Scaffold this active site. Structure first.
Site, mmCIF file in Angstrom:
data_model
loop_
_atom_site.group_PDB
_atom_site.id
_atom_site.type_symbol
_atom_site.label_atom_id
_atom_site.label_comp_id
_atom_site.label_asym_id
_atom_site.label_seq_id
_atom_site.Cartn_x
_atom_site.Cartn_y
_atom_site.Cartn_z
ATOM 1 N N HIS A 12 24.991 -50.442 -14.327
ATOM 2 C CA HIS A 12 23.643 -50.358 -13.789
ATOM 3 C C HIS A 12 23.076 -48.944 -13.789
ATOM 4 O O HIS A 12 23.085 -48.274 -12.761
ATOM 5 C CB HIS A 12 23.651 -50.895 -12.364
ATOM 6 C CG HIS A 12 22.267 -51.220 -11.828
ATOM 7 N ND1 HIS A 12 21.944 -52.396 -11.323
ATOM 8 C CD2 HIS A 12 21.182 -50.386 -11.733
ATOM 9 C CE1 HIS A 12 20.700 -52.345 -10.920
ATOM 10 N NE2 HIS A 12 20.263 -51.130 -11.174
ATOM 11 N N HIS A 14 19.224 -46.956 -15.359
ATOM 12 C CA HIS A 14 18.035 -47.024 -16.192
ATOM 13 C C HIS A 14 17.868 -45.801 -17.078
ATOM 14 O O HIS A 14 18.057 -44.666 -16.643
ATOM 15 C CB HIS A 14 16.794 -47.164 -15.322
ATOM 16 C CG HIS A 14 16.877 -48.308 -14.327
ATOM 17 N ND1 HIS A 14 16.202 -49.438 -14.452
ATOM 18 C CD2 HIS A 14 17.636 -48.372 -13.188
ATOM 19 C CE1 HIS A 14 16.506 -50.214 -13.442
ATOM 20 N NE2 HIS A 14 17.369 -49.557 -12.697
ATOM 21 N N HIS A 211 17.506 -57.828 -10.561
ATOM 22 C CA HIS A 211 17.472 -56.925 -9.427
ATOM 23 C C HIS A 211 17.081 -57.732 -8.199
ATOM 24 O O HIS A 211 16.078 -58.446 -8.225
ATOM 25 C CB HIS A 211 16.416 -55.849 -9.639
ATOM 26 C CG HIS A 211 16.884 -54.647 -10.440
ATOM 27 N ND1 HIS A 211 16.835 -54.590 -11.759
ATOM 28 C CD2 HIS A 211 17.185 -53.400 -9.960
ATOM 29 C CE1 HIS A 211 17.082 -53.359 -12.131
ATOM 30 N NE2 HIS A 211 17.289 -52.660 -11.035
ATOM 31 N N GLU A 214 18.013 -55.793 -3.102
ATOM 32 C CA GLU A 214 17.995 -54.356 -2.913
ATOM 33 C C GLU A 214 17.160 -54.023 -1.694
ATOM 34 O O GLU A 214 17.658 -53.490 -0.704
ATOM 35 C CB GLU A 214 17.392 -53.698 -4.145
ATOM 36 C CG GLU A 214 17.091 -52.220 -3.957
ATOM 37 C CD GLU A 214 16.507 -51.588 -5.210
ATOM 38 O OE1 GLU A 214 15.881 -52.298 -5.992
ATOM 39 O OE2 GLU A 214 16.685 -50.390 -5.409
ATOM 40 N N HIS A 235 22.343 -54.745 -7.200
ATOM 41 C CA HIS A 235 22.277 -54.411 -5.788
ATOM 42 C C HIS A 235 22.817 -55.555 -4.940
ATOM 43 O O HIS A 235 24.011 -55.622 -4.660
ATOM 44 C CB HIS A 235 20.845 -54.083 -5.379
ATOM 45 C CG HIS A 235 20.250 -52.921 -6.159
ATOM 46 N ND1 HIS A 235 20.579 -51.657 -5.959
ATOM 47 C CD2 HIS A 235 19.267 -52.974 -7.109
ATOM 48 C CE1 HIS A 235 19.850 -50.910 -6.745
ATOM 49 N NE2 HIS A 235 19.069 -51.719 -7.426
ATOM 50 N N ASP A 292 22.232 -45.981 -11.106
ATOM 51 C CA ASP A 292 20.844 -46.416 -11.020
ATOM 52 C C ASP A 292 19.861 -45.437 -11.652
ATOM 53 O O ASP A 292 19.308 -45.711 -12.712
ATOM 54 C CB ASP A 292 20.451 -46.683 -9.573
ATOM 55 C CG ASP A 292 19.458 -47.830 -9.417
ATOM 56 O OD1 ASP A 292 19.026 -48.077 -8.295
ATOM 57 O OD2 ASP A 292 19.113 -48.477 -10.409
HETATM 58 O O1 LIG Z 1 14.025 -48.768 -16.114
HETATM 59 C C1 LIG Z 1 13.102 -49.861 -16.111
HETATM 60 C C2 LIG Z 1 12.225 -49.882 -14.866
HETATM 61 O O2 LIG Z 1 12.936 -50.442 -13.753
HETATM 62 C C3 LIG Z 1 12.537 -49.780 -12.542
HETATM 63 N N1 LIG Z 1 13.644 -49.419 -11.760
HETATM 64 C C4 LIG Z 1 14.333 -48.277 -11.829
HETATM 65 N N2 LIG Z 1 15.171 -48.146 -10.798
HETATM 66 C C5 LIG Z 1 14.993 -49.258 -10.051
HETATM 67 C C6 LIG Z 1 15.647 -49.675 -8.830
HETATM 68 O O3 LIG Z 1 17.059 -49.733 -9.003
HETATM 69 N N3 LIG Z 1 15.161 -50.892 -8.319
HETATM 70 C C7 LIG Z 1 14.228 -51.591 -8.968
HETATM 71 N N4 LIG Z 1 13.661 -51.205 -10.105
HETATM 72 C C8 LIG Z 1 14.054 -50.030 -10.631
HETATM 73 C C9 LIG Z 1 11.694 -48.563 -12.924
HETATM 74 O O4 LIG Z 1 10.360 -48.990 -12.674
HETATM 75 C C10 LIG Z 1 11.777 -48.486 -14.442
HETATM 76 O O5 LIG Z 1 10.518 -48.129 -15.017
HETATM 77 ZN ZN LIG Z 2 18.035 -50.564 -10.906
#
Ligand SMILES: OC[C@H]1O[C@@H](N2CNc3c(O)ncnc32)[C@H](O)[C@@H]1O
Ligand SMILES: [Zn+2]
Length: 349
Positions: A12, A14, A211, A214, A235, A292
């Site tokens: 996990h 990005h 996701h 979280e 998460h 993350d």
């Molecule tokens: O990386 C893809 C997209 O996911 C989203 N991300 C990153 N980190 C993140 C977090 O863990 N929770 C939800 N979404 C997330 C960001 O908006 C990013 O542009």
């Molecule tokens: Zn994430």
């Protein structure tokens, strides 16, 4: 002294959330695009996070630099190649990166992102660019790296396209589909677009990961598992609130992509309560440690390992165990998955 000085597996993280502040500064001046700061240090304090904010507050940080990358081919291929380099230094043998191909394109994308000017970098083009920079990093550093295309919660119209991209780049780094974004958006998990994309992924053989938990309730996690049919849960800290749903997921061996430092900085984990991962380590649940968004959380894979070691009392045995599970839950094909488990066991001896 780096907590766990042994091969690791990250499921996990990005890509757009793990870019070198130096590369951001390079393309910001090269393209003439504004930047909150003109120094890697000051740029780190503006994009980075020190205290806990929130999921909608942490997601806004991307607005500071995403425009400097999106639209440029040279920048999309470079951040992918540098990402591998980063993971190679942290001691990660296998990794699964995830990103939204649509947020890095400037053509063929309905709601144009970052107020860009129509260009030629299509979404299918960014998936190919990332595949190249990821493949080059594999030969230059020696680590296996697969990717995961994300579905943005607030943009369900893009979903069906994300699925087609997964089918076209199947195995060519792309091994799964994800649903990231603002979990606070009510009912964003049921938006017909998302539901239809995950329904096709189930009938087309595309792996899934969502996701959830979280920052949402256990119901959100329940929808990702029952309606979306996830094979993993990004998460999933709030799953324990629903004893019944948690024990059921514990019996099915559901994997939980945990991100410790991230949950503290996004508010997903109240610091006056025991972290869910602690309950996972005690119940011997299937989960993995992740980063993350290292860039925004000013961290490194070691940060999370040092957090569970000092706080939560995690032992090396638990580190070798949660990594063997991540390798078992990876979206690798059977053969490749066996090779991964063969390597870890050999290095954990
Ligand atoms: O990386 C893809 C997209 O996911 C989203 N991300 C990153 N980190 C993140 C977090 O863990 N929770 C939800 N979404 C997330 C960001 O908006 C990013 O542009
Ligand atoms: Zn994430």
């Amino acid at each position: 002294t780096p907590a766990f000085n042994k091969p690791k597996v990250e499921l996990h993280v990005h890509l757009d959330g793990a870019i070198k502040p130096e590369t951001i500064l390079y393309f910001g001046k090269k393209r003439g695009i504004a930047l909150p700061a003109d120094t890697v240090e000051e740029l780190r304090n503006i994009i980075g996070m020190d205290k806990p904010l929130s999921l909608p507050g942490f997601l806004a940080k991307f607005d500071y630099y995403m425009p400097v990358i999106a639209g440029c081919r040279e920048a999309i291929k470079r951040i992918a190649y540098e990402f591998v380099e980063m993971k190679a230094k942290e001691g990660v043998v296998y990794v699964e990166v995830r990103y939204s191909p649509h947020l890095l394109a400037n053509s063929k994308v309905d709601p144009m992102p970052w107020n860009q000017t129509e260009g030629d970098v299509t979404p299918d083009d960014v998936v190919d660019l990332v595949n190249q920079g990821l493949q080059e990093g594999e030969q230059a550093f020696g680590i296996k790296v697969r990717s995961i295309l994300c579905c943005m919660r607030h943009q369900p119209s893009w979903s069906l396209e994300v699925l087609e991209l997964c089918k076209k780049y199947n195995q060519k780094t792309v091994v799964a589909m994800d649903l990231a974004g603002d979990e606070t958006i009510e009912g964003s998990s049921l938006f017909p677009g998302h539901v239809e994309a995950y329904e096709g992924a189930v009938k087309n053989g595309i792996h899934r990961t969502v996701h959830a938990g979280e920052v949402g309730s256990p119901e959100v996690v329940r929808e990702a598992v029952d309606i979306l049919k996830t094979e993993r849960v990004g998460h999933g800290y709030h799953t324990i609130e629903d004893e019944a749903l948690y024990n059921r997921l514990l019996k099915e061996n559901m994997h939980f992509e945990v991100c410790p430092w991230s949950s503290y900085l996004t508010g997903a984990w109240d610091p006056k309560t025991t972290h869910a991962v602690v309950r996972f380590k005690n119940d011997k649940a299937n989960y993995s440690l992740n980063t993350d968004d290292p860039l925004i959380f000013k961290s490194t894979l070691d940060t999370d390992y040092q957090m569970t070691k000092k706080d939560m009392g995690f032992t090396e045995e638990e580190f070798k165990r949660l990594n063997i599970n991540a390798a078992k839950s990876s979206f690798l094909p059977e053969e490749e998955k066996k090779e991964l488990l063969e390597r870890l066991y050999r290095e954990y001896q």
